[PDB]
Design a binder for this molecule. Structure first.
Ligand SMILES: CNC(=O)c1cc(Oc2ccc(NC(=O)Nc3cc(C(C)(C)C)nn3-c3ccc4ncccc4c3)c(F)c2)ccn1
Length: 292
C-alpha cells in the first residue's frame, strides 16, 4: 500500500455519509504533487491496491491510520457518479432554452455515451480477468473522472455498508435472473447487469422497468420479458443489450467481446444514439420512489 502522511492531507467538505463511515473531499500531497482526493474515514484497501491502477477502475492514492481511524484516499472523480451525470445531461429538463434552440435532448453526444459504455466494459474485462465479481454494477456505481474517463466503483451497499441512501430493493433491477431466483453471482451475471447499465446510458439515466415493481420482474423476466428498445437507440446497440440478457448465462458475451462491439460502433461514421428533439419526444421515466 502507498502510505500517506497525516500532515500531507488538508480536509474539506463531507461528500457522503453512512452508518459505517464518511467520505470527505480533500487535497493531498503525494510524492511531489498536490492533488484532489476523496477520503473514506472508518479489505477495501487490498482490492483497490490490486485493481485501481486500471484507468477504468477507481484508484487508491494512499492510506493512513491516525488515532483510531483508517483513512483511504481515493482518486477524486470531479464529475461525480454517472447516473447523476447522465440525468444532468437531460437538457430539455435542465436547460430547456438551450435544448429547444439546438433541437437537442442531451449535452452528451452519441460518441460520448458509447465511450462511457466502452470504459466500463474495459474495466470489467480487467476486473473479471483478475477473478473479481462485482455483484452491483449499475450507473450509480460508475464515476466520471478526470477527462471524462469512466471509473468503476462500489459504495458498499452490497456489504450493508453504504456511503451516500439507496432503497434496499433497487439493485433487484440490475440482477440477472439466476441471481434473482438462485442467488447465483458470476462474471456472466455481471454481464447482465452491464446490459442494464448500457440501457441506463442510452436512456440518459432512466429507471429500469420504471412503473413496474420488483415482484413483477421475478415473474416476467423468466417468461422472456426484457427492457424495451429506447426510441433513440439503433438496433445494433439494443442487440448488444439483448445479448447481455440472454437467459442462458453461458451464452452472454464476455466483457472483451462487449468492448470489441462498442469499439466497432465507435469507429464507424454512423450515429447510434439519437439525441435529437422532435415533436412528442419524451425521456425514459425516472421513479424517485423506487430509488430513494
Ligand atoms: C464528486 N465526486 C465524488 O464525490 C467522489 C467520491 C468518491 O468516493 C468514493 C468512491 C469509491 C470508493 N470506494 C470504492 O469504490 N470501493 C470499491 C471499489 C471496488 C472495485 C474496484 C472492485 C469496483 N471495490 N470496492 C470496495 C471493496 C470493498 C469494500 N468493503 C466494504 C465497503 C465497500 C467496499 C468497496 C470510496 F471509498 C469513496 C470518489 C471519487 N469522487
Amino acid at each position: 500500500y502507498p502510505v500517506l502522511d497525516w500532515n500531507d492531507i488538508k480536509f474539506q467538505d463531507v461528500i457522503g455519509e453512512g452508518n459505517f463511515g464518511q467520505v470527505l473531499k480533500a487535497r493531498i500531497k503525494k510524492d511531489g504533487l498536490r492533488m484532489d482526493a476523496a477520503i473514506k474515514r472508518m479489505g477495501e484497501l487490498e482490492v483497490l491496491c490490486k485493481l485501481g491502477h486500471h484507468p477504468n477502475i477507481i484508484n487508491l492514492l494512499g492510506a493512513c491510520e491516525h488515532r483510531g481511524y483508517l483513512y483511504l484516499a481515493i482518486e477524486y472523480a470531479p464529475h461525480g457518479n454517472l447516473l447523476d451525470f447522465l440525468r444532468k445531461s437531460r437538457v430539455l429538463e435542465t436547460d430547456p432554452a438551450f435544448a429547444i434552440a439546438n433541437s437537442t435532448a442531451s449535452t452528451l453526444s452519441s460518441q460520448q455515451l458509447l465511450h462511457f459504455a466502452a470504459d466500463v466494459a474495459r474495466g470489467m474485462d480487467y476486473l473479471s480477468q483478475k477473478q473479481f465479481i462485482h455483484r452491483d454494477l449499475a450507473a450509480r456505481n460508475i464515476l466520471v473522472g478526470e477527462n471524462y474517463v469512466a471509473k468503476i466503483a462500489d459504495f458498499g451497499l452490497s456489504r450493508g455498508q453504504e456511503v451516500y441512501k439507496t432503497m434496499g430493493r433497487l439493485p433487484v433491477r440490475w440482477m440477472a435472473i439466476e441471481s434473482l431466483n438462485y442467488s447465483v453471482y458470476t462474471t456472466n451475471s455481471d454481464v447482465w447487469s452491464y446490459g442494464v447499465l448500457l440501457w441506463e446510458i442510452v436512456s440518459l439515466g432512466g429507471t429500469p422497468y420504471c412503473g413496474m415493481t420488483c415482484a413483477e420482474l421475478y415473474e416476467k423476466l423468466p417468461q422472456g420479458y426484457r427492457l424495451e428498445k429506447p426510441l433513440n437507440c439503433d438496433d445494433e446497440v439494443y442487440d448488444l443489450m439483448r445479448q447481455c440478457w440472454r437467459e442462458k448465462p453461458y451464452e452472454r458475451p464476455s466483457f472483451a467481446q462487449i468492448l470489441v462491439s462498442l469499439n466497432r460502433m465507435l469507429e464507424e461514421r454512423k450515429t447510434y444514439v439519437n439525441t435529437t428533439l422532435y415533436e412528442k419526444f419524451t425521456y425514459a421515466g425516472i421513479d424517485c420512489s423506487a430509488e430513494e
